[PDB]
Amino acid sequence: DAMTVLTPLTEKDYEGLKRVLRSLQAHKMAWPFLEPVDPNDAPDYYGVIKEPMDLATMEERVQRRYYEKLTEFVADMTKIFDNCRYYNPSDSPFYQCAEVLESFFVQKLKGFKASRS
Numbered sequence: 001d002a003m004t005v006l007t008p009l010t011e012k013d014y015e016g017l018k019r020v021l022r023s024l025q026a027h028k029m030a031w032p033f034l035e036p037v038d039p040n041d042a043p044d045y046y047g048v049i050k051e052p053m054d055l056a057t058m059e060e061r062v063q064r065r066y067y068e069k070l071t072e073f074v075a076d077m078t079k080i081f082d083n084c085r086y087y088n089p090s091d092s093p094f095y096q097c098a099e100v101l102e103s104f105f106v107q108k109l110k111g112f113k114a115s116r117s
């Protein structure tokens with residue numbers, strides 16, 4: 001909505017962002033996304049995926065107050081899942097993790113936006 005696009009993230013907001021990030025990191029199906037993709041696990045991953053992203057990179061950015069608006073936090077998180085569904089076929093375990101964990105992220109994001117008032 002309006003707040004998501006326009007309102008700068010505060011320290012109070014960042015407590016909520018850390019909580020969302022921690023809940024995804026704790027999720028059983030987040031295991032493929034905790035750390036940057038290992039090129040030795042994924043042939044030509046870094047020649048195919050132009051903007052890699054992972055939850056540890058996101059954790060560093062949250063710690064550093066990298067994000068000015070919620071939209072940018074959402075865009076990084078969306079990269080994790082969109083990258084995975086582009087690189088992997090739809091029957092891959094990685095792809096299935098992206099489906100589950102994105103739906104979880106959307107639930108938690110909705111709770112974050114509601115409590116932002």
Ligand SMILES: Cn1ncc(Nc2ccc(CN)cc2)c(Cl)c1=O
Pocket residue numbers: 031032033034037038041042045083084087088094
């Ligand atoms: C193509 N590809 N390859 C790997 C991967 N995640 C991952 C993370 C940790 C381990 C254990 N080292 C193994 C796999 C993802 Cl998400 C992906 O899209």
Ligand SMILES: [Ca+2]
Pocket residue numbers: 078079082
């Ligand atoms: Ca995308």
